[PDB]
Ligand binder design. Sequence first.
Ligand SMILES: *[C@@H]1O[C@H](CO)[C@@H](O[C@@H]2O[C@H](CO)[C@@H](O[C@@H]3O[C@H](CO[C@H]4O[C@H](CO[C@H]5O[C@H](CO)[C@@H](O)[C@H](O)[C@@H]5O[C@H]5O[C@H](CO)[C@@H](O)[C@H](O)[C@@H]5O)[C@@H](O)[C@H](OC5O[C@H](CO)[C@@H](O)[C@H](O)[C@@H]5O)[C@@H]4O)[C@@H](O)[C@H](O)[C@@H]3O)[C@H](O)[C@H]2NC(C)=O)[C@H](O)[C@H]1NC(C)=O
Ligand SMILES: *[C@@H]1O[C@H](CO)[C@@H](O[C@@H]2O[C@H](CO)[C@@H](O[C@H]3O[C@H](CO)[C@@H](O)[C@H](O)[C@@H]3O)[C@H](O)[C@H]2NC(C)=O)[C@H](O)[C@H]1NC(C)=O
Ligand SMILES: *[C@@H]1O[C@H](CO)[C@@H](OC2O[C@H](CO)[C@@H](O)[C@H](O)[C@H]2NC(C)=O)[C@H](O)[C@H]1NC(C)=O
Ligand SMILES: *[C@@H]1O[C@H](CO)[C@@H](O[C@@H]2O[C@H](CO)[C@@H](O)[C@H](O)[C@H]2NC(C)=O)[C@H](O)[C@H]1NC(C)=O
Ligand SMILES: *[C@@H]1O[C@H](CO)[C@@H](O[C@@H]2O[C@H](CO)[C@@H](O)[C@H](O)[C@H]2NC(C)=O)[C@H](O)[C@H]1NC(C)=O
Ligand SMILES: *[C@@H]1O[C@H](CO)[C@@H](O[C@H]2O[C@H](CO)[C@@H](O)[C@H](O)[C@H]2NC(C)=O)[C@H](O)[C@H]1NC(C)=O
Ligand SMILES: *[C@@H]1O[C@H](CO)[C@@H](O)[C@H](O)[C@H]1NC(C)=O
Ligand SMILES: *[C@@H]1O[C@H](CO)[C@@H](O)[C@H](O)[C@H]1NC(C)=O
Ligand SMILES: *[C@@H]1O[C@H](CO)[C@@H](O)[C@H](O)[C@H]1NC(C)=O
Ligand SMILES: *[C@@H]1O[C@H](CO)[C@@H](O)[C@H](O)[C@H]1NC(C)=O
Ligand SMILES: *[C@@H]1O[C@H](CO)[C@@H](O)[C@H](O)[C@H]1NC(C)=O
Lengths: 133, 125, 295, 107
Amino acid sequence: QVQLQESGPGLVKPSETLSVTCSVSGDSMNNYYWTWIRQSPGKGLEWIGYISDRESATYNPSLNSRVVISRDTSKNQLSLKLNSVTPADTAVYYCATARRGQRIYGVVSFGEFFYYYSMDVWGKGTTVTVSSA
Amino acid sequence: QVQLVQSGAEVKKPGASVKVSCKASGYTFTGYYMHWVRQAPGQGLEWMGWINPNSGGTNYAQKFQGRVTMTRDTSISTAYMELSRLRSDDTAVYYCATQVKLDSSAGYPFDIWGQGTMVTVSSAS
Amino acid sequence: NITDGELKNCSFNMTTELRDKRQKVHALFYKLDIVPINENQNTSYRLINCNTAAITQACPKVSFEPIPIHYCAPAGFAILKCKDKKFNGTGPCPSVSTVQCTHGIKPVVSTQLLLNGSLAEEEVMIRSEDIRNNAKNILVQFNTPVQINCTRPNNNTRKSIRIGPGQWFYATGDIIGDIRQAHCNVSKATWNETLGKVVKQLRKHFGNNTIIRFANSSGGDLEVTTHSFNCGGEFFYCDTSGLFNSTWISNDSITLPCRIKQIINMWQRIGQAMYAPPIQGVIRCVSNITGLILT
Amino acid sequence: VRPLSVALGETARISCGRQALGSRAVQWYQHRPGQAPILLIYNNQDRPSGIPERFSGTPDINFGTRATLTISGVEAGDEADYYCHMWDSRSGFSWSFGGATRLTVLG
Ligand SMILES: *[C@@H]1O[C@H](CO)[C@@H](O[C@@H]2O[C@H](CO)[C@@H](O[C@@H]3O[C@H](CO[C@H]4O[C@H](CO[C@H]5O[C@H](CO)[C@@H](O)[C@H](O)[C@@H]5O[C@H]5O[C@H](CO)[C@@H](O)[C@H](O)[C@@H]5O)[C@@H](O)[C@H](OC5O[C@H](CO)[C@@H](O)[C@H](O)[C@@H]5O)[C@@H]4O)[C@@H](O)[C@H](O)[C@@H]3O)[C@H](O)[C@H]2NC(C)=O)[C@H](O)[C@H]1NC(C)=O
Ligand SMILES: *[C@@H]1O[C@H](CO)[C@@H](O[C@@H]2O[C@H](CO)[C@@H](O[C@H]3O[C@H](CO)[C@@H](O)[C@H](O)[C@@H]3O)[C@H](O)[C@H]2NC(C)=O)[C@H](O)[C@H]1NC(C)=O
Ligand SMILES: *[C@@H]1O[C@H](CO)[C@@H](OC2O[C@H](CO)[C@@H](O)[C@H](O)[C@H]2NC(C)=O)[C@H](O)[C@H]1NC(C)=O
Ligand SMILES: *[C@@H]1O[C@H](CO)[C@@H](O[C@@H]2O[C@H](CO)[C@@H](O)[C@H](O)[C@H]2NC(C)=O)[C@H](O)[C@H]1NC(C)=O
Ligand SMILES: *[C@@H]1O[C@H](CO)[C@@H](O[C@@H]2O[C@H](CO)[C@@H](O)[C@H](O)[C@H]2NC(C)=O)[C@H](O)[C@H]1NC(C)=O
Ligand SMILES: *[C@@H]1O[C@H](CO)[C@@H](O[C@H]2O[C@H](CO)[C@@H](O)[C@H](O)[C@H]2NC(C)=O)[C@H](O)[C@H]1NC(C)=O
Ligand SMILES: *[C@@H]1O[C@H](CO)[C@@H](O)[C@H](O)[C@H]1NC(C)=O
Ligand SMILES: *[C@@H]1O[C@H](CO)[C@@H](O)[C@H](O)[C@H]1NC(C)=O
Ligand SMILES: *[C@@H]1O[C@H](CO)[C@@H](O)[C@H](O)[C@H]1NC(C)=O
Ligand SMILES: *[C@@H]1O[C@H](CO)[C@@H](O)[C@H](O)[C@H]1NC(C)=O
Ligand SMILES: *[C@@H]1O[C@H](CO)[C@@H](O)[C@H](O)[C@H]1NC(C)=O
């Protein structure tokens, strides 16, 4: 029973910091994973990467690896930093949560399994439009 | 003639690996076992192990368990013996022996021997 | 493209019935039948046997399944069978019978572990030629067979290509399904009970109070270190280290991995190497392990 | 981007574009323009909390079949874009959601 509410600047010139924080309201976080989704008008959803308690920050091999995700336990917030932005990157950004499950078909002693993440609870999402004006 | 040649080795430093060879001729090489024995200067003999060149099945004593490796290249009828993580008390002479000719059928004892190679170590130069 | 592997897809040129045409075909090869040639450092592979010896295929119109074979003596000779329940290997035998000739025998090839043998009676048997010297393998025969199930869950496909006028060449064209390792299962409680029985029987030859320990193979080959056998038309090599890993003094089954080879060199010789055609579908072999061979 | 026009009262079935190879796990998502995407089915047989039991999943037994989401008893609320998410064993880690489909109702 958790709700996430994001806040961002919206209009920002290219090649500066774009930080959209999604504040949390509900129970404490101990096992759930978190994820950010980008959606551009005309294209589908963009699974950019997920965050965990192991300081793991992996992303798509085609996103040039220029965005970083961070979580502060003091303020209990989650933020993202994406530098060198392009005016053609206007999109809506959702901050949601997800859970990891495993699927076994062979023998566990040899590692015949694989993981998969499912985003159960979502957020609201706001649209950011970047340009030189 | 039934005989076994070896290759002399130089003094090695502690913590190094030695390479011992043993080449036979005459009789068929893939029919009988082959043992390895050591002799310390001024002491008695001590058995190291035995290798079967027919199938590569080896068996060595517990004094050298986990420190010696024995191989075989039957394409040229030669054997090998490796040994790393040396010490100072391993200064001795090594021999490779077979049992090519004897009335009895048991594996022991062996009669024919080879030239032999004396291997010794030195801490410094 | 399995991210971080047992088999690899290889593509190569091949002739045709027409002596001038050259086709390009691809197949799947296991990792134990391929050796690099460059090493500095690109990927250019070749087979293992045709550096030293030649190779012949085993056209699949015949089978390798063992069948009973009776050895029957000619007219003029006879066979004598001993029926003692304490035949320690050498010496007289009170109960002697004369039979026309023997019963069926299954000439099954195996290493480190007998298979489909003959069960003992009322006890386990521990035989050898000389026990007091370390130069003779010791035979052990159980009194109750242990069940063992080997399986390769892959789903292979036979792909046939032409190699010349009137010839054919089979290969594993594709694996459809889930890439997984072929394994073999053995019951745990029965194995521990059998090991207890055999050590209790072996204690008679080495003092009434001694420590008995087991260890895995020494090493130095791919045929007498692992457990090697054949079934369903395929040759397996299942590691047996997970069995002789105990120490004796005074429903949760065990699993064992298995590798598969194709270009074998069985019946040790020179100038010969037997290819094995792939079997289509899945393989499942149940066996009665009964014997043991221990240095 | 692929439309599918099915009138009211007809039971439609939409499948995923990219087929799978081996052990399979498919997830379904629905997205309306302006709203938030909500999942429909996960693990190919499980039903989440807060969904009518009218969307029957595709059980994956005796591999050789395909994945397809059906709609039984369509209403005014079941008209949006659909997304299929594939996870298998012989492809590694899937990142993109792939192509999507759009459903339209008649009458
Ligand atoms: C040689 O021996 C080896 C040694 O065992 C043999 O190896 C095994 O091989 C079998 C088959 O080859 C293999 O089974 C495979 O297992 C998978 C997974 O099974 C697991 O999960 C399902 C579903 O579940 C989840 O949901 C239930 C209900 O809600 C929960 O109770 C459960 O805990 C699971 O929750 C998990 O997921 C949640 C997310 O959904 C997560 O939040 C949780 O935290 C959990 O992680 C189970 O149904 C299944 O179990 C079952 O066993 C029951 C008792 O026998 C039966 O009623 C049913 O089968 C029941 O499903 C299991 O727990 C299956 O999906 C495959 O179908 C397959 O069976 C097994 O993993 C291997 N390993 C072991 C240790 O057994 C080998 O086969 C053998 N070979 C030969 C040739 O002899
Ligand atoms: C030890 O003896 C076993 C006999 O119980 C033997 O198992 C049999 O092996 C065959 C070989 O493929 C299996 O398949 C055979 O039987 C099926 C029956 O449908 C036929 O379709 C096949 O063509 C083939 O003839 C058997 O399933 C299997 N079990 C039995 C009960 O027959 C083991 O293979 C023997 N061990 C070794 C190492 O050979
Ligand atoms: C190995 O893969 C085969 C190809 O998919 C598969 O074969 C068939 O079986 C399915 C399941 O019943 C049928 O739907 C299909 O028509 C069959 N096709 C042919 C050509 O036979 C095998 O079943 C798979 N192996 C195993 C053990 O399932
Ligand atoms: C080994 O390589 C061959 C050729 O590169 C693969 O064969 C083709 O497989 C690809 C899959 O990436 C298909 O797109 C092609 O249509 C296939 N045929 C041809 C003529 O290219 C083969 O699949 C590879 N092996 C494995 C196990 O993936
Ligand atoms: C090897 O395979 C046989 C054949 O399936 C297994 O035997 C059976 O055991 C299962 C469960 O233990 C029973 O459901 C079957 O009814 C049994 N059948 C027979 C003919 O006995 C055997 O358990 C397998 N071995 C191991 C170690 O699991
Ligand atoms: C037999 O069992 C021993 C038990 O460990 C295996 O041991 C070792 O060798 C491995 C690789 O050579 C090392 O990774 C291990 O650390 C090492 N362990 C010990 C205790 O020495 C050995 O490999 C097994 N032999 C075979 C042929 O499987
Ligand atoms: C053999 O001669 C023919 C003559 O047309 C020529 O086309 C062919 O190329 C020659 N052989 C080959 C295989 O090149
Ligand atoms: C056949 O050989 C030529 C050159 O020797 C090579 O370019 C070609 O790729 C080979 N065929 C295949 C299918 O690889
Ligand atoms: C079998 O018993 C005889 C009778 O004394 C004995 O001479 C022989 O050594 C024994 N052999 C074994 C293998 O026990
Ligand atoms: C052998 O037994 C020991 C006992 O603890 C265990 O740690 C080890 O993993 C076992 N070896 C194998 C290969 O299972
Ligand atoms: C294996 O043992 C069981 C139980 O005694 C027996 O029924 C079966 O026939 C045996 N297998 C063979 C191949 O004899």
